[PDB]
Design a protein around this ligand. Structure first.
Ligand SMILES: C[C@H](c1cccc2c1CCC2)[C@H](NS(=O)(=O)c1ccc(Cl)cc1C(N)=O)c1n[nH]c(=O)o1
Ligand SMILES: Cc1cn([C@H]2C[C@H](O)[C@@H](COP(=O)(O)OP(=O)(O)OP(=O)(O)O)O2)c(=O)[nH]c1=O
Ligand SMILES: [Mg+2]
Length: 644
């Protein structure tokens, strides 16, 4: 497979022009019909030709050879622009296009970005990679919204918003608690038939079928029916299988589950405003409605708990979000109550009828900052973060917004989401088992570093461009950073005092900064394990384990690993230090996974797309897992449940 990739990359170089500007000209002048349909933007081309000598000479075509086989084949499929079904763009062409698309006339910045991207220190999000240096550059990854109104008018205005966004390659998170339930007066069919409309809309507007995550609060009267919608067994009229499901969960629910108290299901039209308040304020409003008997049904909290867990055991959903933790520990709390997260559970941004929140995303490749000394290069990590911040910050200003509420929101608050990939690789390269105390300090210190670098850059930008419009009155404005909100003290690695002085002086440019996304595609391209996830299995054979065994002349063996679905724990010849290092996710404590998410979480001002891998799950296991996560203060307690 090593040789296979070289052949493939070579073949592509043979079948492509070498000069970057020639490929940019071909792409612009592209003609179908016989209509001039440019595959790149006029502005970008005008700039590329104006700086063609420096831009064409900046590019290092040997870097195309760094891509592994499957990563390279992913690129050809989706990321390299095609003329007439044939690839015109080399990967380096695409990165420079991306680089110039973001940085425009600033050639020094564009080449700085080019070099960082082609050496794979970090990557931008797929939509950026697709559309940067193009007409209608939709570079932002996903979106969040609230139902406009509890009316056919608002419901259908929101459906159109979703259709327009989904057509322009956006994933969606949708808050739907404010919509009235089944059997309810109109001066109502309720939620399930409304969601069927959204479901068919996702199918209709792709090619990848539209990706809509539906967020419901567990007090909603339709909650039990919500939980059935993803089940592969039922009547077509009672189901919606192309949608994705999330619960937006108050502390009060979990408290009453824990104490085996009653739980009241309410109609939002009768019991308004529950999604516009959080914590104590919610608990007062909710209690007060119970005491007014504005309550459509009463169940044991534990009966709803069981149905939540039944649902997850069957489908792996719903996603578990902790509303109160999300709102309490958000720099956006000055804007009002946050009603949902997004498609991937990592983004925690404010929505209103006027505002559709946007996810501007990138990921740092944590593998790259380990030295041959087996030391982590935190300084370099922070330097690259600063660049990504400047890049994402520019993306807000150049992005083509599919609805104007997305534009108003992103410009008002300027949130970004910087993530990571290769966490499990960085541990392996430092010789630290994922669960080890050593991995645990490094986990902490990586995200401390990321958050520090991010803030510094965002502060530098605020010095230059002034603070974001809603900055005054946010927790950061009063000297409160994310770790403060968790009552955590950082390690001695970075000087926060110095940073907090700069922030107090100048402000910051971005309301939020950090959000570890799934990195499902880009991780594969770059040859790293996905996001913050443990090593999923040891089989191609894993390149670090392969290398380690080869070096010890312990490389039959590919076949025994296949025999055990990727474990090397049974195999007797492999020494115990390597076994610890290459435990698969199924041999790794999820309690420790959750603890590590919480520990990082103190330096994550958004949230994390945290999957949970339980091999043989049952009711108690999932109950323990959820309550542990919730009690740790996690914003996202679970993205997908994954099982063996
Ligand atoms: C469900 C349970 C669990 C998860 C999260 C929090 C808590 C628990 C039990 C107490 C609190 C979880 N059990 S488990 O998932 O079945 C499991 C146990 C040990 C190992 Cl090595 C692997 C696995 C696995 N991935 O499949 C767990 N992680 N750590 C632990 O002690 O139990
Ligand atoms: C008209 C109609 C509304 N609905 C739902 C959508 C909304 O959740 C809710 C309200 O729809 P509306 O369009 O607001 O109906 P309305 O204006 O008559 O009601 P009110 O004066 O009480 O506001 O009812 C249906 O499910 N089926 C229907 O045929
Ligand atoms: Mg109405």
């Amino acid at each position: 497979a090593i040789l296979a990739a070289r052949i493939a990359v070579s073949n592509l170089h043979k079948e492509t022009k070498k000069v970057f500007s020639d490929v940019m000209e071909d792409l612009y002048n592209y003609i179908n019909n016989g209509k001039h349909s440019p595959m790149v933007a006029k502005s970008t081309l005008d700039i590329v030709l104006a700086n063609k000598d420096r831009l064409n000479s900046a590019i290092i075509y040997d870097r195309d050879f760094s891509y592994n086989y499957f990563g390279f084949k992913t690129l050809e499929r989706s990321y390299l622009l095609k003329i007439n079904g044939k690839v015109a763009e080399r990967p380096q062409h695409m990165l420079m296009r991306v680089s110039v698309g973001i940085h425009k006339e600033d050639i020094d910045a564009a080449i700085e970005t080019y070099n960082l991207l082609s050496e794979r220190w970090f990557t931008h999000a797929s939509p950026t990679l697709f559309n940067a240096g193009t007409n209608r550059p939709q570079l932002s990854s996903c979106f969040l919204l609230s139902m406009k109104d509890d009316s056919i008018e608002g419901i259908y205005d929101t459906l159109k918003q979703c259709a327009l966004i989904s057509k322009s390659a956006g994933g969606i998170g949708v808050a739907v608690s404010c919509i009235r339930a089944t059997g309810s007066y109109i001066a109502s069919n309720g939620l399930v038939p409304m969601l069927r409309v959204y479901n068919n809309t996702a199918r209709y507007v792709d090619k990848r079928p539209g990706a809509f995550a539906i967020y419901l609060e567990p007090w909603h009267l339709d909650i039990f029916e919500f939980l059935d919608l993803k089940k592969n067994t039922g009547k077509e009229e009672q189901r919606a299988r192309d949608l994705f499901f999330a619960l937006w969960i108050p502390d009060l629910f979990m408290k009453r589950v824990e104490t085996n108290q009653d739980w009241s299901l309410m109609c939002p039209n009768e019991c308004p405003g529950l999604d516009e308040v959080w914590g104590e304020e919610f608990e007062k409003l909710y209690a007060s409605y119970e005491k007014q008997g504005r309550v459509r049904k009463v169940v044991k909290a534990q009966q709803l708990w069981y149905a939540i867990i039944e649902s997850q055991t069957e489908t792996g959903t719903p996603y578990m979000l902790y509303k109160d933790s999300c709102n309490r520990k958000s720099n956006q709390q000055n804007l009002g109550t946050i009603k949902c997260s997004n498609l991937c559970t990592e983004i925690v941004e404010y929505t209103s009828k006027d505002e559709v929140a946007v996810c501007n995303l990138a990921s740092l490749a944590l593998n790259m900052y380990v030295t041959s000394e087996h030391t982590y290069d935190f300084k370099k990590l922070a330097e690259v973060t600063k660049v990504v911040v400047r890049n994402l910050n520019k993306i807000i200003d150049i992005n083509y917004y599919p609805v104007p509420e997305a534009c108003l929101s992103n410009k008002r608050h300027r949130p970004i989401g910087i993530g990571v990939q290769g966490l499990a690789d960085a541990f392996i390269l430092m010789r630290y088992p994922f669960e080890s105390a050593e991995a645990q300090l490094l986990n902490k210190q990586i995200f401390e570093t990321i958050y520090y670098g991010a803030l510094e850059a965002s502060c530098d930008l605020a010095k230059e461009q002034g603070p974001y419009e809603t900055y005054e009155g946010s927790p950061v404005s009063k000297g409160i950073l994310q770790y403060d909100m968790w009552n955590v003290t950082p390690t001695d690695l970075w000087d926060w005092k110095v940073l907090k002085e700069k922030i107090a002086k100048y402000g910051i440019r971005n309301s939020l900064l950090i959000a570890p996304m799934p990195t499902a595609s880009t991780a594969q391209i770059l040859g790293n394990n996905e996001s913050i996830e443990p090593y999923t299995s040891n089989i191609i054979v894993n390149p670090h384990l392969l290398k380690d065994l080869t070096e010890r002349g312990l490389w039959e063996m590919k076949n025994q690993i296949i025999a055990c679905n990727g474990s090397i724990q049974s195999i007797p010849e492999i020494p115990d230090d390597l076994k610890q290092l290459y435990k698969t996710v199924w041999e790794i404590s999820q309690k420790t996974v959750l603890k590590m998410a919480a520990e990082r979480g103190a330096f994550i001002d958004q949230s994390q797309s945290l999957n949970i891998h339980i091999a043989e799950p049952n009711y108690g296991k999932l109950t323990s897992m959820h309550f542990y996560g919730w009690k740790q203060g996690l914003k996202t307690g679970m993205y997908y449940l994954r099982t063996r």
